[PDB]
Short mmCIF file of C-alpha atoms and ligand atoms in Angstrom, two decimals:
data_model
loop_
_atom_site.label_atom_id
_atom_site.label_comp_id
_atom_site.label_asym_id
_atom_site.label_seq_id
_atom_site.Cartn_x
_atom_site.Cartn_y
_atom_site.Cartn_z
CA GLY A 1 14.84 124.03 141.27
CA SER A 2 14.84 120.49 142.69
CA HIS A 3 16.76 117.59 141.06
CA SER A 4 17.00 113.83 141.09
CA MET A 5 19.24 110.96 140.09
CA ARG A 6 17.54 107.62 139.32
CA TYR A 7 18.68 104.22 138.09
CA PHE A 8 16.23 101.71 136.59
CA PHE A 9 17.01 98.03 136.05
CA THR A 10 14.96 95.31 134.37
CA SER A 11 15.86 91.61 134.08
CA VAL A 12 13.69 89.21 132.08
CA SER A 13 14.37 85.48 132.36
CA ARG A 14 14.82 83.37 129.20
CA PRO A 15 13.82 79.77 130.09
CA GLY A 16 14.36 78.54 126.52
CA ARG A 17 18.07 79.29 126.42
CA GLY A 18 20.64 81.46 128.08
CA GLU A 19 20.80 84.25 130.62
CA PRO A 20 18.16 86.89 131.41
CA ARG A 21 17.87 90.02 129.25
CA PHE A 22 19.16 92.88 131.42
CA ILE A 23 18.70 96.60 130.73
CA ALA A 24 19.97 99.38 133.03
CA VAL A 25 19.39 103.10 132.51
CA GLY A 26 20.49 106.12 134.56
CA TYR A 27 18.79 109.52 134.62
CA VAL A 28 19.46 112.97 136.03
CA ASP A 29 16.02 114.59 136.17
CA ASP A 30 14.42 113.73 132.79
CA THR A 31 17.76 113.22 130.98
CA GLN A 32 19.08 109.72 130.36
CA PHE A 33 22.88 109.74 130.78
CA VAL A 34 24.03 106.06 130.91
CA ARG A 35 22.87 102.69 129.74
CA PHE A 36 23.80 99.03 129.80
CA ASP A 37 22.12 96.34 127.72
CA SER A 38 23.22 92.70 128.09
CA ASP A 39 22.34 92.21 124.36
CA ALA A 40 24.60 95.08 123.19
CA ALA A 41 28.11 94.46 121.79
CA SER A 42 30.19 96.60 124.11
CA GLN A 43 29.37 94.79 127.39
CA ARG A 44 30.17 98.14 129.01
CA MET A 45 28.23 100.92 130.68
CA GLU A 46 27.78 103.46 127.82
CA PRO A 47 27.33 107.24 127.80
CA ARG A 48 24.04 108.76 126.63
CA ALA A 49 24.62 112.46 127.41
CA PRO A 50 27.59 114.64 126.31
CA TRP A 51 28.42 115.81 129.86
CA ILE A 52 29.13 112.27 131.14
CA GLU A 53 31.70 111.55 128.35
CA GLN A 54 34.39 113.57 130.19
CA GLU A 55 34.43 110.96 133.00
CA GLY A 56 37.72 109.04 132.91
CA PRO A 57 38.55 105.34 132.45
CA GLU A 58 38.28 104.52 136.17
CA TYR A 59 34.64 105.75 136.08
CA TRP A 60 33.70 103.66 132.99
CA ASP A 61 35.52 100.53 134.18
CA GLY A 62 33.99 100.88 137.65
CA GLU A 63 30.41 101.42 136.37
CA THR A 64 30.81 98.50 133.98
CA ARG A 65 31.97 96.19 136.81
CA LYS A 66 29.11 97.33 139.08
CA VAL A 67 26.38 97.12 136.45
CA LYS A 68 27.45 93.59 135.44
CA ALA A 69 27.41 92.63 139.15
CA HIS A 70 23.85 94.10 139.37
CA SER A 71 22.86 91.88 136.42
CA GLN A 72 24.19 88.78 138.22
CA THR A 73 22.31 89.69 141.43
CA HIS A 74 19.09 89.92 139.36
CA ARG A 75 19.85 86.60 137.69
CA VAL A 76 20.21 84.91 141.11
CA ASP A 77 17.08 86.67 142.38
CA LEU A 78 14.96 85.39 139.48
CA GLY A 79 15.94 81.83 140.54
CA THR A 80 15.24 82.54 144.24
CA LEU A 81 11.80 84.04 143.43
CA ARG A 82 10.82 81.12 141.21
CA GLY A 83 11.48 78.99 144.34
CA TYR A 84 9.70 81.34 146.82
CA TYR A 85 6.56 81.37 144.58
CA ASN A 86 6.74 77.62 143.65
CA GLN A 87 6.82 78.45 139.93
CA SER A 88 7.79 76.31 136.95
CA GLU A 89 11.20 76.56 135.21
CA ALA A 90 9.25 77.01 131.91
CA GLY A 91 7.90 80.59 132.14
CA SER A 92 9.63 83.96 131.73
CA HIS A 93 9.54 86.28 134.76
CA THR A 94 10.73 89.82 135.44
CA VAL A 95 12.46 91.66 138.23
CA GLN A 96 12.63 95.48 138.31
CA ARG A 97 14.65 97.71 140.61
CA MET A 98 14.75 101.48 140.97
CA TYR A 99 16.92 103.51 143.31
CA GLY A 100 18.11 107.09 143.62
CA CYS A 101 17.94 110.39 145.41
CA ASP A 102 16.22 113.79 145.32
CA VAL A 103 17.83 117.15 146.25
CA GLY A 104 16.13 120.49 146.72
CA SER A 105 16.86 123.95 145.24
CA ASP A 106 19.91 124.20 147.61
CA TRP A 107 21.16 120.76 146.25
CA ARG A 108 20.90 119.22 149.76
CA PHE A 109 19.44 115.73 150.28
CA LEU A 110 15.61 115.62 150.32
CA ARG A 111 14.77 111.90 149.97
CA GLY A 112 16.11 108.52 148.89
CA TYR A 113 14.54 105.39 147.36
CA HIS A 114 15.25 101.77 146.70
CA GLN A 115 12.25 99.76 145.34
CA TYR A 116 12.01 96.22 143.91
CA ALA A 117 9.25 94.42 142.01
CA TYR A 118 8.61 90.89 140.80
CA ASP A 119 6.37 90.34 137.76
CA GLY A 120 5.27 93.98 137.84
CA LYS A 121 4.10 94.05 141.44
CA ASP A 122 5.68 95.54 144.56
CA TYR A 123 8.00 93.09 146.32
CA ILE A 124 10.14 95.03 148.82
CA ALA A 125 10.90 98.74 149.24
CA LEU A 126 13.04 100.83 151.58
CA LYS A 127 10.84 103.23 153.57
CA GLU A 128 11.45 107.00 153.50
CA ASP A 129 13.23 106.79 156.90
CA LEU A 130 16.00 104.79 155.07
CA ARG A 131 15.93 102.36 157.99
CA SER A 132 12.75 100.27 157.54
CA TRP A 133 11.32 97.94 154.86
CA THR A 134 7.91 97.51 153.25
CA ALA A 135 7.42 93.82 152.36
CA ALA A 136 4.28 93.22 150.24
CA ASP A 137 3.82 89.47 150.98
CA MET A 138 5.33 86.58 152.91
CA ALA A 139 8.08 85.91 150.35
CA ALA A 140 9.17 89.55 150.69
CA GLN A 141 8.88 89.19 154.49
CA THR A 142 11.57 86.44 154.27
CA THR A 143 13.78 88.88 152.30
CA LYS A 144 13.05 91.62 154.87
CA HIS A 145 14.27 89.50 157.79
CA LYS A 146 17.41 88.56 155.77
CA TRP A 147 18.16 92.23 154.88
CA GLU A 148 17.65 93.39 158.47
CA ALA A 149 20.28 90.80 159.55
CA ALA A 150 22.71 91.92 156.80
CA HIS A 151 22.73 95.73 157.59
CA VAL A 152 21.34 96.45 154.08
CA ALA A 153 19.33 99.56 154.92
CA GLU A 154 22.46 101.05 156.59
CA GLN A 155 24.47 100.54 153.37
CA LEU A 156 21.65 102.02 151.27
CA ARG A 157 21.16 105.03 153.55
CA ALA A 158 24.93 105.74 153.41
CA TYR A 159 24.82 105.68 149.58
CA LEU A 160 21.57 107.66 149.24
CA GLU A 161 22.59 110.51 151.58
CA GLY A 162 26.26 110.40 150.52
CA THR A 163 27.52 109.08 147.17
CA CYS A 164 24.18 109.54 145.38
CA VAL A 165 23.83 113.25 146.25
CA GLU A 166 27.56 113.96 145.78
CA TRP A 167 27.60 112.50 142.29
CA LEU A 168 24.25 114.14 141.38
CA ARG A 169 25.82 117.54 142.30
CA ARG A 170 28.88 116.69 140.16
CA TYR A 171 26.69 115.83 137.14
CA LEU A 172 24.54 118.97 137.58
CA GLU A 173 27.71 121.09 137.48
CA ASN A 174 29.32 119.23 134.55
CA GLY A 175 26.10 119.28 132.55
CA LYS A 176 25.00 122.77 133.66
CA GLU A 177 24.46 124.07 130.11
CA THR A 178 21.50 121.67 129.65
CA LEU A 179 20.71 120.17 133.05
CA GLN A 180 20.26 123.54 134.74
CA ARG A 181 18.47 125.08 131.70
CA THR A 182 14.67 125.09 131.82
CA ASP A 183 12.85 125.05 128.48
CA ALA A 184 9.47 126.69 128.91
CA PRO A 185 6.64 125.22 126.80
CA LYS A 186 6.11 126.77 123.39
CA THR A 187 2.32 127.06 123.29
CA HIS A 188 -0.33 127.56 120.63
CA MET A 189 -3.97 126.74 120.01
CA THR A 190 -5.50 124.92 117.03
CA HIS A 191 -9.16 124.67 115.97
CA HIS A 192 -10.80 121.65 114.36
CA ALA A 193 -14.45 121.80 113.31
CA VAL A 194 -16.44 118.67 114.34
CA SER A 195 -19.69 119.87 112.60
CA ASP A 196 -21.05 123.09 111.10
CA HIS A 197 -21.76 124.35 114.65
CA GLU A 198 -19.16 122.83 117.08
CA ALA A 199 -15.40 122.64 117.13
CA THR A 200 -12.49 121.18 119.07
CA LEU A 201 -9.98 123.69 120.52
CA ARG A 202 -6.62 122.03 121.15
CA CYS A 203 -4.06 123.67 123.41
CA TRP A 204 -0.46 122.57 122.68
CA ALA A 205 2.65 122.69 124.85
CA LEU A 206 5.78 121.78 122.90
CA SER A 207 9.52 121.42 123.32
CA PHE A 208 9.55 121.77 127.10
CA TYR A 209 11.88 120.47 129.80
CA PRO A 210 11.54 119.12 132.45
CA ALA A 211 8.57 116.89 131.68
CA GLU A 212 6.36 118.01 134.59
CA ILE A 213 3.57 120.32 133.35
CA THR A 214 -0.11 121.11 133.95
CA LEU A 215 -2.64 122.03 131.24
CA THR A 216 -6.16 123.01 132.29
CA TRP A 217 -9.22 124.43 130.55
CA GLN A 218 -11.52 127.05 132.01
CA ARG A 219 -14.89 128.31 130.70
CA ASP A 220 -15.82 131.86 131.83
CA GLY A 221 -13.02 131.61 134.46
CA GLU A 222 -14.05 128.29 136.09
CA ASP A 223 -12.39 124.87 135.54
CA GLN A 224 -13.89 122.74 132.74
CA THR A 225 -13.40 118.92 132.63
CA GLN A 226 -16.66 117.99 130.70
CA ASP A 227 -15.97 117.47 126.95
CA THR A 228 -12.19 117.65 127.45
CA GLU A 229 -9.34 115.32 126.56
CA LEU A 230 -5.72 115.42 127.99
CA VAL A 231 -2.97 113.15 126.42
CA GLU A 232 -0.12 111.73 128.46
CA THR A 233 3.09 113.84 128.35
CA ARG A 234 5.24 112.36 125.60
CA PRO A 235 8.87 112.64 124.51
CA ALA A 236 9.63 114.67 121.37
CA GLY A 237 12.78 112.58 120.78
CA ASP A 238 15.22 115.49 121.05
CA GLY A 239 15.22 115.47 124.87
CA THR A 240 12.13 117.72 125.25
CA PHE A 241 8.49 116.84 125.88
CA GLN A 242 5.04 117.54 124.46
CA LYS A 243 1.45 117.54 125.70
CA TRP A 244 -1.94 118.78 124.57
CA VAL A 245 -5.39 119.35 126.04
CA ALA A 246 -8.60 119.77 124.04
CA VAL A 247 -12.19 120.87 124.58
CA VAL A 248 -15.29 120.67 122.33
CA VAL A 249 -17.20 123.95 122.19
CA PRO A 250 -20.21 125.48 120.42
CA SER A 251 -18.89 127.40 117.39
CA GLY A 252 -18.96 131.15 118.02
CA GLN A 253 -18.34 130.67 121.77
CA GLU A 254 -14.58 130.10 121.62
CA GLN A 255 -13.70 133.26 123.55
CA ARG A 256 -15.26 131.84 126.74
CA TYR A 257 -12.56 129.15 126.85
CA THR A 258 -9.04 129.58 128.16
CA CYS A 259 -6.18 127.11 128.42
CA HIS A 260 -3.82 127.54 131.40
CA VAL A 261 -0.25 126.25 131.29
CA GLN A 262 1.92 125.76 134.39
CA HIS A 263 5.61 124.77 134.16
CA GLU A 264 8.81 125.36 136.13
CA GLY A 265 10.19 127.40 133.19
CA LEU A 266 7.26 129.88 133.38
CA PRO A 267 7.58 132.61 136.09
CA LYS A 268 3.78 133.04 135.77
CA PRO A 269 1.32 130.51 134.22
CA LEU A 270 0.35 131.20 130.61
CA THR A 271 -3.27 131.76 129.46
CA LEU A 272 -4.23 131.05 125.83
CA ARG A 273 -7.41 131.75 123.88
CA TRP A 274 -8.35 130.94 120.30
CA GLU A 275 -7.36 133.66 117.75
CA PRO A 276 -10.65 134.17 115.75
CA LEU B 1 27.24 106.72 140.17
CA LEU B 2 25.82 103.22 140.84
CA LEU B 3 25.60 101.39 144.14
CA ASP B 4 28.30 98.73 144.51
CA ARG B 5 27.63 95.26 146.07
CA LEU B 6 23.95 94.38 146.29
CA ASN B 7 22.45 91.91 148.68
CA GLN B 8 20.51 89.10 146.98
CA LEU B 9 16.78 88.58 147.82
CA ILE C 1 0.15 91.09 135.80
CA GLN C 2 -0.56 91.76 132.09
CA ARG C 3 -1.23 95.49 131.25
CA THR C 4 -1.97 96.52 127.67
CA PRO C 5 0.09 99.23 125.93
CA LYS C 6 -1.19 102.77 125.48
CA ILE C 7 -0.09 104.17 122.11
CA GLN C 8 0.50 107.67 120.75
CA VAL C 9 1.77 108.26 117.21
CA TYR C 10 2.92 111.80 116.41
CA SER C 11 5.59 113.93 114.81
CA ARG C 12 8.51 115.58 116.60
CA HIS C 13 7.77 118.96 114.88
CA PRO C 14 4.44 120.44 113.60
CA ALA C 15 3.93 118.73 110.30
CA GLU C 16 4.24 120.49 106.93
CA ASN C 17 3.85 118.49 103.70
CA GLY C 18 7.18 118.08 101.94
CA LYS C 19 9.27 119.06 104.99
CA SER C 20 11.36 116.40 106.77
CA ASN C 21 10.51 115.51 110.32
CA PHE C 22 10.53 112.56 112.73
CA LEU C 23 7.72 110.06 113.28
CA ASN C 24 7.29 108.79 116.86
CA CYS C 25 5.38 105.92 118.36
CA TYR C 26 5.32 106.15 122.14
CA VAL C 27 4.17 102.95 123.89
CA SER C 28 3.58 102.98 127.61
CA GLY C 29 1.71 101.43 130.52
CA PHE C 30 2.45 97.82 129.50
CA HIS C 31 3.66 94.70 131.27
CA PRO C 32 5.56 92.42 130.55
CA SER C 33 8.24 94.30 128.57
CA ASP C 34 8.43 92.11 125.45
CA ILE C 35 6.62 94.01 122.68
CA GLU C 36 6.71 94.35 118.91
CA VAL C 37 6.41 97.85 117.43
CA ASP C 38 6.61 98.85 113.78
CA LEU C 39 6.16 102.19 112.05
CA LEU C 40 4.23 101.86 108.75
CA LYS C 41 4.21 103.87 105.55
CA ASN C 42 1.11 103.00 103.45
CA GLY C 43 0.62 99.81 105.47
CA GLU C 44 4.25 98.62 104.94
CA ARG C 45 6.96 98.29 107.61
CA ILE C 46 9.57 101.06 107.67
CA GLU C 47 13.00 99.44 107.97
CA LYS C 48 15.25 102.05 109.58
CA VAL C 49 13.44 102.38 112.98
CA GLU C 50 15.22 102.96 116.29
CA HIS C 51 13.98 102.84 119.88
CA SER C 52 14.85 104.12 123.32
CA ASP C 53 16.27 102.03 126.14
CA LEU C 54 13.60 100.25 128.18
CA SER C 55 12.53 102.09 131.34
CA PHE C 56 9.46 102.11 133.55
CA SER C 57 7.09 104.24 135.58
CA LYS C 58 6.25 104.34 139.34
CA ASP C 59 3.60 101.62 138.84
CA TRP C 60 6.31 99.35 137.21
CA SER C 61 4.74 99.58 133.75
CA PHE C 62 7.17 99.95 130.86
CA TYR C 63 7.57 102.61 128.21
CA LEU C 64 9.47 102.91 124.91
CA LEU C 65 9.79 105.44 122.14
CA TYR C 66 10.15 104.08 118.54
CA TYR C 67 11.18 106.66 115.93
CA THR C 68 12.39 107.34 112.40
CA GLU C 69 12.83 110.18 109.97
CA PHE C 70 9.89 110.85 107.64
CA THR C 71 8.54 113.45 105.27
CA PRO C 72 4.75 114.03 105.61
CA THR C 73 2.86 114.36 102.32
CA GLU C 74 -0.73 114.71 101.16
CA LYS C 75 -0.78 111.15 99.75
CA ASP C 76 1.08 109.02 102.30
CA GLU C 77 -0.48 107.34 105.32
CA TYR C 78 1.71 106.69 108.40
CA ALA C 79 0.89 104.48 111.35
CA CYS C 80 2.25 102.53 114.30
CA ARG C 81 1.54 98.76 114.66
CA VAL C 82 1.88 97.16 118.10
CA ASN C 83 1.72 93.55 119.22
CA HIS C 84 1.86 92.41 122.83
CA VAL C 85 0.81 89.33 124.86
CA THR C 86 -2.30 91.32 125.99
CA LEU C 87 -3.45 91.79 122.35
CA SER C 88 -5.44 89.22 120.25
CA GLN C 89 -4.26 90.90 117.01
CA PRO C 90 -1.79 93.79 116.21
CA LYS C 91 -3.17 97.24 117.10
CA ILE C 92 -2.71 99.85 114.33
CA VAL C 93 -2.91 103.56 115.24
CA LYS C 94 -2.96 105.96 112.27
CA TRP C 95 -0.90 109.15 112.47
CA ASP C 96 -2.99 112.35 112.45
CA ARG C 97 -0.89 115.58 112.31
CA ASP C 98 -3.40 117.33 114.54
CA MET C 99 -2.81 114.96 117.49
CA1 CA D 1 -24.88 118.28 119.57
CA1 CA D 2 -0.62 89.02 120.83
#
């Protein structure tokens, strides 16, 4: 199937004392593999998946140098933005950055991204052409003219179509035992009476990977959204995910209702009904 | 692998 | 922007009384990132609680998983307590093994 590599960075200013709090995380698909936290003791990029631990000292020293340099860029940016938006030195503000690449089933480049936000709102983003910029307001328009003059999109395009995809392929190979394994959802249905004549049917999908999944209810073979509830996909904590969908039904009529589960690990979607 | 030098805003 | 956290409290494995498991509190959809999350056993704070590294969604809102080992029983009540700048008072969500 398709794969992705993504890095996420958050910096939160601390006007009271000291430097911003900085947290960086790296993912391959839905698997975290590296982290940096400015509050942690190591002051190094740290492994979070077994398959990245084999990387040598040059890798760890290099990623530590680069992630600390990213933290300093965010620190400077928080100051610049406070100036661009004419804000007080007294409040805490946040910058967020995400970048990475997607490859298809053949592991060839599909798309690249580099997005930045200030205080939880879009600031500037590289367009899908990897040449152009989306600036949300006039402060970001100032950044856009600066980054056009500094050949920034060229540098990002070279990384996104080159380094990013090359290293994603390396990680997919090194971590093949888990990264290239799909864990189909383990499904079951539960029944919870809500009165002496109606009940909730809850369709569960457990221990699946990757996180993408679709759960839908049908009644007599047509989609049912009335009297249904669908929770957000949630992490189990062991690297897999969970979700459920529920419907309220008249007791005795449970056989009319079917839950349909779609996932990359299922060659054909599953259909579940309540076991009377 | 991370990007290297970033351009400030 | 200030976005309030969504909360789910649930076990890693289907719960069976007397069998060890893991209690999760998944907080998501919030902004800014500073947040206080505790897992409770009979209204009291559980001390050995860990959490994931801060990350965020496409819409820039943050998410975290807080977790600890626990053993469900017939008598004990478990819950997650969340405080955030968007909340007037801490929000307590009781764990229900069926959800
Ligand atoms: Ca009724
Ligand atoms: Ca509050």
